[PDB]
Design a protein around this ligand. Structure first.
Ligand SMILES: [Ca+2]
Ligand SMILES: [Ca+2]
Ligand SMILES: [Cl-]
Ligand SMILES: [Cl-]
Ligand SMILES: [Mg+2]
Ligand SMILES: [Mg+2]
Ligand SMILES: [Mg+2]
Ligand SMILES: [Mg+2]
Lengths: 228, 4, 228, 4
């Protein structure tokens, strides 16, 4: 599909699509780039994440609108169209999970790449869990938790407490606990420990690293304000 | 409440 | 494609897609509804227009970003991707023009329907003209102008000067003159005459009709401020 | 500058 296009041209077109706010295009360019089989640089991993974040973010917001309407109603149309949007969302999550399993994660040896991809695996199972019902929901939740836990274990061993990758993983795992796993205390404990550990490490940073880390710390704080 |  | 879905279900799903901001879906539901072959009510014509307005609006904004980048640059990638977005835009315009030609306009006998569809024909040729180059550009411009002129002629004979359909047609034909036809004086004259004629008719309106008409009059005024 |  993007098999005939040069890797470098796919990356170039992904950045153009980002400028144009054409996130479905950007995601398809980045899927093509991944399927070239080469590992992704830091910049390229960020392009991949931004593209699919935006695509699934749209689908999630739409699914929430439709599910709200369907709940209020409780003919077949609202259910039918919520299911169409749900299926397309699951498809996008399955596509991203597929890229990570074939073969991004297994080739990723450095902590910055491995933690990034395992956080992504956690996040896309987490979006699957948001629309899942029943027992099915359990196995998906456990997949998300496992991915996030492996990423946390590597990040705590390999990265400083202020590393933005590590801080963003902890932010999302804390949201997983509060919103998916019905564990608001675990969510608050994680976000509070993560914030306090980063605070203590800020003195080590340059002005630009300080701004990157404090930005994500503020997100942990905003959640802690919401949750306490 | 997640990143981004 | 939507051939197996009930007309009423297509309309219902178009309104759900609007609530969800899923405008590509809304447009496909409304295309299915049109292709049922029945005339559209006022509410349904508005659904059709909103859906495709939003879809082509996105494409237009993206094409403008890409064309700006391409102009700055003046490898093949920026040109290639601007052409992809351009082709998809032309496709959406050709689809809407196709619905109007088969067979919305020919069945539309009342002034409110006929003016609405001919304004739409003008607007979608106008979007084609925005990306067209050369002689090709001339014939498309003339198609837009012809459509807008037929709509103006019916609106002046059949609707009061404050009718929002008539006011929106005049607003868009004025923009056609200023932005496409290189006729800024014709644009200003049209917008000024249209505003003054509506002003004089406001006394006839209810409070709610007054708000509908003055809203579009303010858009004519905002353009006149920009252009003078 | 058009409608909408
Ligand atoms: Ca459906
Ligand atoms: Ca392309
Ligand atoms: Cl996608
Ligand atoms: Cl479309
Ligand atoms: Mg090559
Ligand atoms: Mg407690
Ligand atoms: Mg029927
Ligand atoms: Mg003059």
């Amino acid at each position: 599909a993007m098999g005939s296009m040069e890797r470098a041209s796919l990356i170039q077109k992904a950045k153009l699509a980002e400028q144009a706010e054409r996130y479905e295009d950007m995601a398809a360019f980045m899927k093509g780039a991944v399927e070239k089989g080469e590992e992704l640089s830091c910049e390229e991993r960020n392009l991949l994440s931004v593209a699919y974040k935006n695509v699934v973010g749209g689908q999630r917001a739409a699914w929430r609108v439709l599910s709200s309407i369907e709940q209020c109603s409780n003919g077949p149309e609202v259910r039918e169209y919520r299911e169409k949007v749900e299926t397309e969302l699951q498809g996008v999550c399955d596509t991203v999970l597929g890229l990570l399993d074939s073969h991004l994660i297994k080739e990723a040896g450095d902590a910055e790449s491995r933690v990034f991809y395992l956080k992504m695996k956690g996040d896309y199972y987490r979006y699957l869990a948001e629309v899942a019902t029943g027992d099915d929901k359990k196995r998906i939740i456990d997949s998300a938790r496992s991915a996030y836990q492996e990423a946390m274990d590597i990040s705590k061993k390999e990265m400083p407490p202020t590393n933005p990758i590590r801080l963003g993983l902890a932010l999302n795992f804390s949201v997983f606990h509060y919103e998916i796993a019905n564990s608001p205390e675990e969510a608050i404990s994680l976000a509070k420990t993560t914030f306090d550990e980063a605070m203590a490490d800020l003195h080590t940073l340059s002005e630009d690293s300080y701004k990157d880390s404090t930005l994500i710390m503020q997100l942990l704080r905003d959640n802690l304000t919401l949750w306490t | 409440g997640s990143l981004g």
